[PDB]
Amino acid sequence: QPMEEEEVETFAFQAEIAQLMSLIINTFYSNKEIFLRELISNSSDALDKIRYESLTDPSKLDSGKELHINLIPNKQDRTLTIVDTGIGMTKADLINNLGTIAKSGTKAFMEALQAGADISMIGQFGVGFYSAYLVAEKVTVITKHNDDEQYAWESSAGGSFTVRTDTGEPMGRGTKVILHLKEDQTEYLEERRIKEIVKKHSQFIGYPITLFVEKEL
Numbered sequence: 606q607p608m609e610e611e612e613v614e615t616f617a618f619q620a621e622i623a624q625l626m627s628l629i630i631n632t633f634y635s636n637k638e639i640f641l642r643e644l645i646s647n648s649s650d651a652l653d654k655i656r657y658e659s660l661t662d663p664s665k666l667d668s669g670k671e672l673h674i675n676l677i678p679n680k681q682d683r684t685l686t687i688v689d690t691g692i693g694m695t696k697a698d699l700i701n702n703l704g705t706i707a708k709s710g711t712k713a714f715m716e717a718l719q720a721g722a723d724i725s726m727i728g729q730f731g732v733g734f735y736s737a738y739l740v741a742e743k744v745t746v747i748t749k750h751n752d753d754e755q756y757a758w759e760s761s762a763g764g765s766f767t768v769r770t771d772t773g774e775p776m777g778r779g780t781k782v783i784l785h786l787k788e789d790q791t792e793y794l795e796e797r798r799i800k801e802i803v804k805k806h807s808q809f810i811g812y813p814i815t816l817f818v819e820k821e822l
């Protein structure tokens with residue numbers, strides 16, 4: 606009878622990760638724009654990985670040979686999406702690497718901030734993904750790894766995230782980070798803003814970065 610039915614799992618964030626997310630989403634910072642640099646850096650790393658694999662196994666690219674990053678503002682949905690065709694994440698990858706396992710860099714980073722370091726350094730501690738919450742009230746991550754199903758990860762912070770199978774629109778391979786922006790952060794939906802931040806901070810990314818301005822007609 607139902608059109609669709611999907612099992613949804615809810616996981617608690619590891620304690621230090623939950624602390625970091627609260628610090629990030631609540632604290633005032635003057636340089637929030639660095640979130641885009643961090644997410645693009647993540648995409649680049651994921652692209653480096655699938656590329657490495659394809660060096661010895663070309664069939665790794667059967668799911669798509671183009672290695673690139675797309676930025677997609679949607680003013681109607683108030684979302685900014687960063688899409689890449691990197692190696693993507695398995696379900697275990699999602700759960701392990703985006704929430705439940707703390708890396709040493711998590712506590713280290715919060716220690717660094719209290720010691721006077723800047724939020725812009727977050728990427729050096731290996732947790733730059735969470736800078737997304739500088740500007741987003743909710744983040745949705747859609748991801749597809751070779752040989753695996755497509756999954757959707759989601760969290761509005763507050764201590765937990767969900768995982769479920771995603772059947773919406775099939776990706777060949779890679780990861781899509783959908784930022785549901787805070788009301789006062791909608792500037793990052795504007796073309797001039799996206800362009801100047803990419804020019805300023807992502808100068809040396811070795812993959813094509815393309816803007817797609819989305820409007821439902």
Ligand SMILES: Cc1ccccc1[C@H]1CCCN1C(=O)c1ccc(O)cc1O
Pocket residue numbers: 644646647648649650651652654689691692693694702703734748779780782
């Ligand atoms: C960098 C990183 C940190 C933690 C977990 C996974 C990753 C990368 C490398 C392996 C797969 N992966 C992604 O799918 C991915 C994730 C977030 C993101 O914003 C863009 C992405 O492409």
